[PDB]
Structure 1
Amino acid sequence: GQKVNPVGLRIGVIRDWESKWYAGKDYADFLHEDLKIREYISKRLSDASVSKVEIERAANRVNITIHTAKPGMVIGKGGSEVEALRKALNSLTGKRVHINILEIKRADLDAQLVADNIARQLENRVSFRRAQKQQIQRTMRAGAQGVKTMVSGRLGGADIARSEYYSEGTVPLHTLRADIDYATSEADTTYGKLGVKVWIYRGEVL
């Protein structure tokens, strides 16, 4: 018996859906193509890294906003590449699309980016101890109020798995006023499967 997802609980009261469009009688296919474009862009931008992408609807014209500073580097050199990929989104959606790039300053306190960092450090053969203990203090001095991070799977001791987590700070999950951002990521290793769960207390909301 495990905990409820914190952002899962906080959606709609202190968090927006990250899909801000109304539909009716088109809800199913709008939703489906939303998942399709999410999957496509996440797959093909994983190397550049991106946390969260919102979708917006107007006159049957989809429009997007995409996060993280690295797609900032995709603006300049990939400015041709931005048009090249959004051509694919046009082809998929049928009707043409608009996009926007928003830069997440201070990436050390984005849950998904942190999770992807941990996943990469794990998959290129670095020890969970070094990776996790370094990342927690990185985020803390980046200026979070509290962090708890956790990894699970066959943690080196391949013959049996276990769980482990570090944390330092204040992190209330039961309070429905905090801004506990949450993410999780999956890391595939030779000796099994590794999963990551990281969340950070940014601050309350008023």
Structure 2
Amino acid sequence: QKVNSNGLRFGINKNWISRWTANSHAQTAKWLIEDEKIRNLFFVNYRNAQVSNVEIERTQATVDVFVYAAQPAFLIGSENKNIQKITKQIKQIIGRTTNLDLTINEIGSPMLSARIIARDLANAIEARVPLRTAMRQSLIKVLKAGANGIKVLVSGRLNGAEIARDKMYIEGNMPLSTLRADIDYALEKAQTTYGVIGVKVWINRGMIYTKGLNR
């Protein structure tokens, strides 16, 4: 009823956010349970840098972490302190003897990943910014980076029991069915004093074509 063709888009038309091969069917569960904690901690702990994504590879208890962020300057910080904190935190979270190497790379139109977009939209909603103006702020955040058409929805509660009053933004070419579309969909569950609110963003990295295979 409400589905986005992103599982088939990620993996055969694009890559995964956590990709790794293995020969056993038992450690896969342990690795998938272990790496999600690292990913979530890195996302929540570093929002001033707007960490776009983290790639995790796990082979034989060997964990390697790569980071892509919209504002990588805050990852390093002034006098290079935050970089040392990040390195030690990631080295310790993966194991005492687990190897770790990291490089800092940027992406064109850095604020094109729906994750940080939804996080900042929720922050604006709960940061003295009215819902319409928070919507506009999220729209500028995706747009001023250099991204294509925008879909923004905020569902849940208005501190009441009514379900027939809300606002939603659609602007531009966002085919929900095109596999080769480069669409990022993210959701945030924000805790308000009256419930949980879902902030969802569909952002186009670019209307991609002739690139339908994995890279």
Asked if Structure 1 and Structure 2 have the same fold, meaning a TM-score greater than 0.5 normalized by the shorter chain, the answer is yes
Which stretches of structure 1, 4 residues or more, deviate above 6 A after TM superposition? none
2:126 aligned with 1:149? no
Q: Which has the higher helix share?
A: 1
Structural RMSD (CA): 2.6
> Structure 2: 5+ residue runs without aligned partners?
211-215
Residue 104 of structure 2 aligns to a residue in which SS? coil
Distance 2:195 2:18 in 1: 34
Aligned to 2:9: 10
Residue 50 of structure 2 aligns to a residue in which SS? coil
Question: Which of residues 192, 199, 213 is equivalent to 1:189?
Answer: 192
Aligned to 1:53: 54
For 1:46, the aligned partner's letter is: R
Deviation at 1:123, TM superposition (A): 1.0
CA distance 1:133–1:85, change in 2 (3 Å): closer
Aligned to 1:199: 202
Identity rate, percent: 41
Distance 2:29 2:79 in 1: 33
CA distance 1:96–1:145, change in 2 (3 Å): closer
Deviation at 1:141, TM superposition (A): 5.3
Deviation at 1:163, TM superposition (A): 4.1
Distance 1:137 1:178 in 2: 21
Distance 1:78 1:44 in 2: 19
Distance 1:92 1:61 in 2: 12
Residue 46 of structure 1 aligns to a residue in which SS? coil
Distance 2:144 2:87 in 1: 37
State whether residues 158 and 192 of structure 1, in contact with CA within 8 Å, keep that contact through their aligned partners in structure 2.
Answer: no
State whether residues 64 and 100 of structure 1, in contact with CA within 8 Å, keep that contact through their aligned partners in structure 2.
Answer: no
Distance 1:31 1:117 in 2: 27
Q: TM-score, normalised by structure 2?
A: 0.80
CA distance 1:99–1:27, change in 2 (3 Å): same
Deviation at 1:12, TM superposition (A): 1.2
Distance 2:137 2:84 in 1: 38
